[PDB]
Write the C-alpha cells for this entry.
Amino acid sequence: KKAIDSRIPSLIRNGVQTKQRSIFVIVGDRARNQLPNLHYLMMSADLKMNKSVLWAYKKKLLGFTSHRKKRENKIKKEIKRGTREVNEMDPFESFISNQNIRYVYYKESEKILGNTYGMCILQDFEALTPNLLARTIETVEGGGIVVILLKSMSSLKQLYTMTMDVHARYVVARFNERFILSLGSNPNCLVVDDELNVLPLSGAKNVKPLPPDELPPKQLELQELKESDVQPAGSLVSLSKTVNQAHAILSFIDAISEKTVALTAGRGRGKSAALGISIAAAVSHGYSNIFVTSPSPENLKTLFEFIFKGFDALGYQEHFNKAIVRVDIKQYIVPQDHQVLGQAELVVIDEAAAIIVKNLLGPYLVFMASTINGYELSLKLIQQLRNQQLREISLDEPIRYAPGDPIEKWLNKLLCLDVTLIKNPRFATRGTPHPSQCNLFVVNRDTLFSYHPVSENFLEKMMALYVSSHYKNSPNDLQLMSDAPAHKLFVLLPPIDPKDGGRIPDPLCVIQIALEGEISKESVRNSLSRGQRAGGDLIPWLISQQFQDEEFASLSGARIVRIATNPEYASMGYGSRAIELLRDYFLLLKLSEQPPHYLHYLGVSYGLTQSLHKFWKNNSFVPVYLRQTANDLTGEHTCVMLNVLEGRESNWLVEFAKDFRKRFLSLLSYDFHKFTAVQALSVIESSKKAQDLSDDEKHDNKELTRTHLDDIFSPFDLKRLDSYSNNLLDYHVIGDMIPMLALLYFGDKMSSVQSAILLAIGLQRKNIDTIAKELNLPSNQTIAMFAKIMRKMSQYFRQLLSQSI
Amino acid sequence: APMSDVGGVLMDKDAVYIDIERGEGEKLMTGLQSVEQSIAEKFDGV
RNA sequence: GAUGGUAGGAUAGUGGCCUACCAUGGUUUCAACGGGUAACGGGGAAUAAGGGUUCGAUUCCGGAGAGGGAGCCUGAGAAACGGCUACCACAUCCAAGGAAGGCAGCAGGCCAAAUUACCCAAUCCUAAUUCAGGGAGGUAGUGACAAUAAAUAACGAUACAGGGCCCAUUCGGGUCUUGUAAUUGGAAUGAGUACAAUGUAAAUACCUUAACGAGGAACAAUUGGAGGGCAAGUCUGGUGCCAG
RNA sequence: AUACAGUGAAACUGCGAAGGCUCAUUAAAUCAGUUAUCGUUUAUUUGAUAGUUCCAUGGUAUAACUGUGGUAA
C-alpha cells in the first residue's frame, strides 16, 4: 500500500464537481490493471454517475478475451491444474468480469454514435483517427475519464519530443505528435506511469477545488413555470438538457403548433440534442398537427429522432435495410429521399435534415418547413432562407452532457473544428494586387503541424480555408492532409510587406499520384502491408487503359478553396492555379520560398471533382483537358464524377489529346443511358473536349469527313426521302425519329450549328421529346424553335445528299 | 465497501492508498517530471 | 390374421412375424374370455436365526424416461443414461452478425436446511499385468427423542449434651442410646488429565495400560411439595393492646 | 554416443467410467424352474484345426510441425 499523488484523485473530484471530462494517458506494460482503480475513483467521486465503459481497440485485446464463458472455463481448468485457488480474482479480472464494457473496433466507431458512457479506454495509440477521437470523447459524459494507453515506440517519441521540438525517426505521422503537444497544453489531462507515478509534462499543478448551477436552476424555474398540460408533458420529456434546448423546443412549439407557412430551421453543434428536440417535438406536432408529416433525413440514419418520437409517444399516449415504416394507434410519417413526393406532398409539415441545397429548395416549398442544421454552406442556406416563408429560425449551442469543457476545447483545437470568417487582411484592393501578382508559397507541413501558437493560428486559418464551404470533408481528411507522404500545399495569401500578420487567400492541396514516387512509396508501404494513394491514375488506367498514363507521374488536386467574399475570390483562385502551373513548369520555418521554385518530375496535372457548372467554368479557365468521367450517381449530391487532367510536361500532348478524343467519343453515346443533365453544360463539355483535342493535336487525330457510301449505309434512301418531306413539309416522327440518331451522331461528329440548332442537336442526342428540352432551356417560341430545328435538319440533309448522292 | 480496500484502493480521508523504455520512464519520473515546465515554447516568440 | 394350408419377404434363425391365394376355422361349464385390491403387497424370491410362530434375510411391483413424440448410427451384446438429423417449446452467451445443451435436473425446507471426508486393506470385477484401477464396495465424522448399567462416598476414633421417637378428636398414653454446620484419623478409588502399545490401508472407537488425580472429598445432581418464624417496616378493617 | 539413445508441457495411441433416479398400477403373458434349438447368434474361456507359379524388397498422400491469417467466440 502506498499513497499515490495529491493530484490524480483531486482531478477526478473536481472533474465531477464541475461536470467536466478528464483525460489520463498511461504508459508502460502493466497499465491494464490500473483501470479498476481509476474506475473505482470515478464512481466513488460521485455515485450518481453512469457506469458503462468503452474499450475501443483496433485488432486484438491486451491480455484478455472479452468472452466470459471462455475465460470462465479457462479459469476452471486453471483450478483443475492447481496454480490458483478457487475464490481468487485479481482486480483486472474482476473489473472485466463485473463491469459493463462495450467493445468496438477502431473501424466500426460509427456504431456507437448515440449512447453514453462514463469511461472510455482507448487501447492503441499509434493509430488514432480524429473522427474516432471526436466520436468517443463526445460520448464520454461530464463525470468522465478518457484513458489512453501507450507503447514503447510512443515512449521513445515522448522522451524525444518532451524536451523541446525533436521527433521520431521512422509515411511519417505528425498527428500523434500534435496530439502529444495538445495533451501537454491541456489542464484536464495528465500522463501517468504504469506504477501510478506522475509525469508533470502535461498539466503539472492541480489543486483540490473547494467543496460546494444558475442556468440549470433557471431551467428548472422556467420548466416549472411552463408546467403550472400535454405541452408541459412534452416539455419535461424533452428538457433533459440545457435551458437553451428547452427554450428552442418551446419556441419551435409556439411558432409551429397552430401557425400553418413558417420556415423554422434550428442550427446547432454535434451536442445539445437537435435530433432529440426534433423527435420530442414530433409527438406534440402529431397531437396539434396534420395527419401526415414528411421527414427528409438520410435513409436509415434517423436514430435519435425516431427514438425520441417513439419515446415521447409512449410518454404521452401510445399502444431491405431496416424498418422506417409509419405507425399509428389512435398519424403518418415517412423518412423519404429527394422530392419524388411532389405530388405526394399533401402533408402540411415537412422536417428536413442538415445539408443538397437545390434538392432542399425543391422539397421545401408548400408546407411548414422544419429543418435541422447540424454543424458537425450554412451561410448560403441562411441566405436562401432570407431570400424567400415567415422564417422564425433560431437555435443555440449550450452543451448537453456538460455545461462547458476543457476536454471539448482541446478536442476542437486538435481536430480543428473551430473557424473564423474575419478578414484580417492588408486591404481588399491590395489583395487584388496579389491577384495581379499571382504569388504563392509552400506550406512546410512538418513545422506547420508542430503545434506552436502563431503557427496553430495560421493553421486554423488554413483549415478554415481548406474546409470553408467545401464538398463535405472530415477530420480523417485533415489527418490525410497532415500525415501522408504524397502531399503538399500552397498558401498564396499576402503580397504586402507589413509586420507579423496576413491571411489565407487560396489553399490548394496536391497529391503526387506518381509512377516513380508512388512506386517508391508503395514498395515501401507493402512491407507495412497496406496503402491506397493512386486514384486519378488508376481511374484512367482502367477506363482508357493507357501505358502512357501508367508510366507518367501525376499531380492530383485533393482540394482547393478560396475566400467566400466575391468574384475576386474566384479570380484569386485562378491566379493561385496559374501560379501553381508556373511553379510546376518553371527546427523549420512555417513557409517556403526557394522550395516554391522546386518541384518533382511530374507529367500530368489533374483535378478530380463532381460535375458542377462553376467547377466546369473553373476547369475551362484552367483549360486542363476534360477527361473521362463516371455517371454513377454518388448519392451525396447525385453529381457525376469527372477528373479533368492537363498535360504540362515535355512530350505527352498526343497521349492527352487522344484521351480527350476517346472521352469525347464515349460521351455522346453515354449521354443516352445515364447523362440527362443539361444542354448548355453538355455543349460546354463537348466544347471542352474538342478544345483539348485542338490544343493538344497538330494534325494527328484529325478525322476525315462523312464518306459517301458509308453515309449512304448509315441512313436510308427512304429516310432521306422523309428528310426531304420534312424539308418541304412537316417534320413529324415518321421521318424525324428513325434518322435522328444518325443525325445527332454525325452532327456532333463533324458545317456549323446555331445556339438553337446546337440545343436541337443535343436534344436529339438526349432523345427527349419536343416540348421538354427546348421549352425548359429557351422557354420562348416553342413551335418556332421546332421549325428552326427542322430547318437545320433540312440543311444537314441537303448537305449530306448534295455531298454523297 | 468504502473505508476499506475493494481490490487495492484503500480510501483514507483525502488520500488514496494503492499498491503494486524502462529506464526512460524511470528517469522521466525521477528527474524529468516537472523539468518540462519551461520547455513549452522552444523559442516560440509569437 | 381370427384358425390352418402353399409360396415368397424379413430374420440370428423356427414361426400368419408380414403380404398374395385358398379353406371357415379355434378356445370354452373338465371353467374360455372378462372383474380388483391390505398386485408401498404378493408369489419360496431367498437367508435362515437353539422358543419371535404369518415382525424376523433379500431378487422382482408392471413397463417406460433421459424436455416431447419421429427417423437414423455404433457394437460379441443396444432400438445406448455417454451420437446425429428434422419439427415444437424451454433456455444461456452475444460486439445482434451467429455458436449452443439440456441443470423444465437432483439434493433440501414447509425454531435439529452442515451428510457430498479417507481407502481398494477386505469381497468381487476389469486389466497388455509378477504393477494398474473400480463414488462397485469398505471405513470414519456431524446430526440425543431420559432407552441403558455405574458414581456423587466408605470406615473408625474422640468430645459434649439429655432427650429423641410413636399413637390419639380430647385429656393424655406408649417406648427407648439418642443427638451435634462438635472435633478428628488414615485407607479406598472413580470421573478427569495422560505414557503408551494394540487395533486398523490409515485414523477413530472398543480392549490392555504405566504417571498425576478428593476433602466445602468446591472434582459444587436436580425437581416438586408441606410448614413456620422475624422488623422502631407497610396496608386494610373497628366496640383500646385486636383481627386480617 | 555428429542417422536413435534420459527428464518430458500439448497431440495420436491401448483402455477408464463395465451399470444410477422418478413416474402410470401387469393375475403363471411380470416372474421362477424346466424341455429343446441337426429351429439360431456369439467377443472372450477351453479342446482341436490349411498343398493351382510361359517372354535382395513395391506408390504418392496426409499428420504432428512450421508459416500466413480470419472471428466476440
In short: Residues 66-69, 102-105, 108, 111 of chain A lie near RNA strand C (CB under 10 Å from a C1'). Chain A is about 45% helix and 10% strand. The longest helix of chain A spans residues 782-804.
